[PDB]
Design a protein around this ligand. Structure first.
Ligand SMILES: OC[C@H]1O[C@@H](O)[C@H](O)[C@@H](O)[C@@H]1O
Length: 313
């Protein structure tokens, strides 16, 4: 059979959720799969694995580039070798990759900022925590958030980059609350940030006093949402990113690139035709959590939190 390789950005449970989609699609379509993440943000590790996949003669590659520019030459080389390439989770739109499969990161951040604006009444101080200052998804989320709060009196008083290191996400957030005792809110951009901010807020006895709006729906985040430490999180569909990345690359092998692209959503921004699978976003709050868990279970998306139903056939 064919082999399809997938490269993500860090060891976080988020990437395990992606990997479970990769595995599921591998079984469903009968294709071997390979998955790699470095421990934290590490463009050279990604680049090295990319080169390995090409040298192994894989039939397709999906990559979540920590730096959109740095990966362009190696993606070009894969394409020259006849290896189709797609991105997932975060993009490199000038690379030659055929499809981006992931969240509308700009719109998700914009939604987060509208939520923050309402939560704070259009006023107060926010600290941002993120794990990249180069990955487009982070840049887009932060820009969306800023654009959405622009008209209000809200001020961003720090943007802190942990480079996808959870210990560092914790220490930076802790330092921020100590530096800013009048902090009104944290915004968490990557999966590490919400729960790190939640831990710090809870440790400081500021639950509900310092609001948290964040990203993702890993079990640690969901538990803080349940407890009311996190008021809202922008849930992605990592399982679907992994699953549909394998599916697209599989099709590009079986029916070809052109035929596959004709099946997908086509977009055209600034006159440039491109192909994008929006895996969607779910705003998750304490008030809609049970409904969220219901939604994911019925969508067939595994969530290792809360109750589960089994139908006996
Ligand atoms: O930090 C863990 C992960 O957080 C997610 O929110 C992002 O989409 C990923 O790009 C990142 O690697």
């Amino acid at each position: 059979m064919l082999t399809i390789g997938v490269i993500g950005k860090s060891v976080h449970p988020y990437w395990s959720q992606v990997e479970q989609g990769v595995k599921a699609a591998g079984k469903a379509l009968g294709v071997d799969t390979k998955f790699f993440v470095p421990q934290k943000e590490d463009i050279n590790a990604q680049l090295q694995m990319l080169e390995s996949f090409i040298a192994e003669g894989v039939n397709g590659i999906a990559i979540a580039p920590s730096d959109p520019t740095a990966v362009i030459p190696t993606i070009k080389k894969a394409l020259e070798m006849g290896i189709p390439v797609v991105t997932l989770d975060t993009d490199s739109p000038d690379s030659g990759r055929y499809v981006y499969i992931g969240t509308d990161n700009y719109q998700a951040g914009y939604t987060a900022g509208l939520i923050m604006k309402e939560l704070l009444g259009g006023k107060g101080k926010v600290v941002i925590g993120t794990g990249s200052l180069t990955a487009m998804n982070s840049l887009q989320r932060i820009q969306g958030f800023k654009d959405a709060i622009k008209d209000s009196e809200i001020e961003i008083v720090d943007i802190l980059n942990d480079e996808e290191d959870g210990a560092r996400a914790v220490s930076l957030a802790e330092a921020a609350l100590n530096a800013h005792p009048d902090l009104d809110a944290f915004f968490g951009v990557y999966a590490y940030n919400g729960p790190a901010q939640a831990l710090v807020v809870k440790n400081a006895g500021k639950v509900g006093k310092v609001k948290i709006v964040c990203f993702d729906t890993t079990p640690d985040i969901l538990q803080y949402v349940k407890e009311g430490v996190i008021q809202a999180t922008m849930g992605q569909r990592p399982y679907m990113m992994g699953y549909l990345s394998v599916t697209v690359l599989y099709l590009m092998n079986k029916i070809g690139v052109q035929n596959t692209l004709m099946m997908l959503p086509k977009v055209k921004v600034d006159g440039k035709v491109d192909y994008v699978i929006d895996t969607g976003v779910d705003v998750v709050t304490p008030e809609n959590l049970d409904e969220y868990l219901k939604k994911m279970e019925e969508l067939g998306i595994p969530i290792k939190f809360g109750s589960h139903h089994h139908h006996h056939h």
